[PDB]
Design an enzyme around this catalytic site. Structure first.
Site, short mmCIF file in Angstrom:
data_model
loop_
_atom_site.label_atom_id
_atom_site.label_comp_id
_atom_site.label_asym_id
_atom_site.label_seq_id
_atom_site.Cartn_x
_atom_site.Cartn_y
_atom_site.Cartn_z
N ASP A 43 0.85 -1.19 0.00
CA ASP A 43 0.00 0.00 0.00
C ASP A 43 0.89 1.24 0.00
O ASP A 43 1.65 1.46 0.95
CB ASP A 43 -0.91 -0.04 1.23
CG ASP A 43 -1.86 1.12 1.39
OD1 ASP A 43 -1.57 2.22 0.88
OD2 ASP A 43 -2.94 0.99 2.03
N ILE A 44 0.89 2.10 -1.01
CA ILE A 44 1.78 3.27 -1.11
C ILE A 44 1.29 4.31 -0.14
O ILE A 44 0.10 4.69 -0.23
CB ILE A 44 1.80 3.79 -2.56
CG1 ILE A 44 2.40 2.73 -3.52
CG2 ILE A 44 2.54 5.13 -2.63
CD1 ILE A 44 3.84 2.35 -3.22
N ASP A 73 -0.24 18.25 -12.95
CA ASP A 73 0.33 17.95 -14.27
C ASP A 73 1.81 18.32 -14.27
O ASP A 73 2.10 19.49 -14.59
CB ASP A 73 -0.39 18.74 -15.38
CG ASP A 73 0.14 18.37 -16.74
OD1 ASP A 73 0.76 17.30 -16.92
OD2 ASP A 73 -0.11 19.21 -17.65
N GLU A 119 8.07 16.91 -21.91
CA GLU A 119 6.81 16.39 -22.45
C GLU A 119 5.93 17.52 -22.95
O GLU A 119 5.17 17.32 -23.92
CB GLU A 119 6.12 15.53 -21.37
CG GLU A 119 4.86 14.84 -21.88
CD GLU A 119 3.55 15.61 -21.83
OE1 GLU A 119 3.54 16.67 -21.12
OE2 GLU A 119 2.58 15.20 -22.49
N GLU A 120 5.94 18.67 -22.29
CA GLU A 120 5.05 19.75 -22.69
C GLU A 120 5.47 20.38 -24.04
O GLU A 120 4.68 21.14 -24.57
CB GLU A 120 4.99 20.80 -21.58
CG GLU A 120 4.46 20.32 -20.24
CD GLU A 120 2.98 20.02 -20.23
OE1 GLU A 120 2.30 20.10 -21.28
OE2 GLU A 120 2.46 19.67 -19.13
N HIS A 161 -2.68 23.42 -16.68
CA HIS A 161 -1.72 24.31 -17.32
C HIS A 161 -1.78 25.73 -16.77
O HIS A 161 -1.37 26.67 -17.46
CB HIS A 161 -1.91 24.31 -18.86
CG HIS A 161 -1.31 23.06 -19.46
ND1 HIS A 161 -1.31 22.82 -20.81
CD2 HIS A 161 -0.74 21.96 -18.89
CE1 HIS A 161 -0.71 21.65 -21.04
NE2 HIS A 161 -0.35 21.10 -19.88
N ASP A 203 -4.23 8.85 -3.97
CA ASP A 203 -3.94 7.62 -3.20
C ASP A 203 -4.26 6.35 -3.97
O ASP A 203 -3.48 5.42 -4.12
CB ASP A 203 -4.78 7.69 -1.92
CG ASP A 203 -4.44 6.66 -0.86
OD1 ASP A 203 -3.33 6.08 -0.91
OD2 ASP A 203 -5.30 6.47 0.04
N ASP A 205 -1.58 3.62 -5.34
CA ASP A 205 -1.69 2.22 -4.96
C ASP A 205 -1.89 1.31 -6.18
O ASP A 205 -1.35 0.21 -6.23
CB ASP A 205 -2.88 2.03 -4.01
CG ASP A 205 -2.67 2.69 -2.68
OD1 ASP A 205 -1.49 2.93 -2.28
OD2 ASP A 205 -3.66 2.93 -1.92
N1 PHI Z 1 0.07 14.89 -21.51
C1 PHI Z 1 -0.84 15.97 -21.15
C2 PHI Z 1 -1.89 15.53 -20.13
C3 PHI Z 1 -2.46 14.18 -20.60
C4 PHI Z 1 -2.47 13.11 -19.72
C5 PHI Z 1 -2.96 11.90 -20.15
C6 PHI Z 1 -3.41 11.74 -21.44
I1 PHI Z 1 -4.04 9.86 -22.02
C7 PHI Z 1 -3.34 12.79 -22.34
C8 PHI Z 1 -2.88 14.03 -21.91
C9 PHI Z 1 -0.07 17.17 -20.63
O1 PHI Z 1 1.08 16.98 -20.22
O2 PHI Z 1 -0.66 18.26 -20.54
CA CA Z 2 -2.28 4.12 -0.19
ZN ZN Z 3 0.87 15.81 -18.36
ZN ZN Z 4 0.53 19.35 -19.46
#
Ligand code: PHI
Ligand code: CA
Ligand code: ZN
Ligand code: ZN
Length: 275
Positions: free
Chosen positions: A3-4, A97, A131-132, A245, A260, A264
């Protein structure tokens, strides 16, 4: 699987929040809050016994980083990966995010070490940069992973936005064994899930070269429907994440229950799929 502890995940988010505040308000690619985020995560992993690698790339004229953490041992020919992007947009701290996925993946990696786990499959965790900017870090990783190592990947599990304050519980509908693993966890909680469609995250470069993928998501700018509020609570007609964002994607922009449960579920799936 263990359990985290929710408090441990929340504490990583507090550290990322302070890192953003100490570095101009964000953790974005090419800005000091991103490398400071990498440094925090890497130090925890190094102390727990991981073999970590800083994978550098250049995008937009600025150095970016992916942080790769291999748990020593396991079958080198059967590698299970889990990851999360560690960058934010420059408008704010990116706590949902994607501090949320980053923290869940980190706490699962620390839980492996705390539990003395020796998975049959080799475990590798990743925190992606940029990633953005368009999945730049995860594309760099897949583009630079030799085909012989690509074929050793049993799966890639992705966690990107898993603490949305008005959450849904979405599970990617990709590899069937990975999806079943996550849905089984939620069935044990009696929490219904839906197929992810809202989403464009770091599983895409892996999926597109045939690596099995899956993941968890609690929603972003789309509006929660009447039916989804009936199954999950919260507020129909409001975004899953009203601070997507935004500068308000702060420590206050987290639903603890969703964080949570998804943390988990991440640990459940990583244990189940690695042995
Ligand atoms: N990657 C996007 C947020 C996102 C999460 C999951 C899915 I499936 C698609 C988009 C971002 O970083 O804003
Ligand atoms: Ca937990
Ligand atoms: Zn994201
Ligand atoms: Zn994002």
């Amino acid at each position: 699987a263990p359990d985290i502890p929710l408090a441990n995940v929340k504490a990583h988010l507090t550290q990322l929040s302070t890192i953003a505040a100490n570095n101009g308000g964000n953790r974005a690619h090419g800005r000091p809050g991103y490398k400071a985020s990498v440094d925090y995560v890497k130090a925890k992993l190094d102390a727990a016994g991981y073999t970590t690698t800083l994978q550098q790339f250049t995008s937009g004229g600025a150095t970016g980083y992916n942080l790769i953490a291999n748990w020593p041992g396991g079958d080198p020919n059967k590698v299970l990966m889990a990851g999360a992007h560690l960058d934010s947009v420059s408008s704010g701290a990116g706590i949902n995010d994607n501090g949320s996925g980053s923290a869940a993946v980190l706490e699962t990696a620390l839980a492996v070490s705390r539990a003395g786990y020796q998975p049959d499959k080799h475990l590798r965790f990743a925190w992606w940069g940029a990633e953005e900017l368009g999945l730049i870090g995860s594309k760099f990783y897949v583009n630079n992973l030799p085909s012989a190592d690509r074929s050793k990947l049993a799966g890639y599990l992705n966690f990107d936005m898993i603490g949305s304050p008005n959450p849904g519980y979405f599970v990617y509908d990709d590899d069937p064994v990975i999806e079943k693993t996550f849905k089984n966890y939620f069935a044990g909680l009696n929490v219904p899930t839906e197929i992810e469609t809202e989403g464009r995250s770091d599983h895409a470069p892996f999926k597109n070269v045939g690596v099995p993928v899956g993941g968890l998501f609690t929603g972003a700018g789309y509006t929660k429907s009447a039916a989804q509020a009936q199954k999950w609570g919260g507020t129909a007609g409001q975004a899953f994440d009203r601070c997507y964002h935004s500068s308000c994607d702060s420590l206050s922009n987290i639903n603890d229950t969703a964080l949570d449960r998804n943390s988990d579920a991440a640990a459940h799936a990583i244990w189940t799929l690695s042995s």
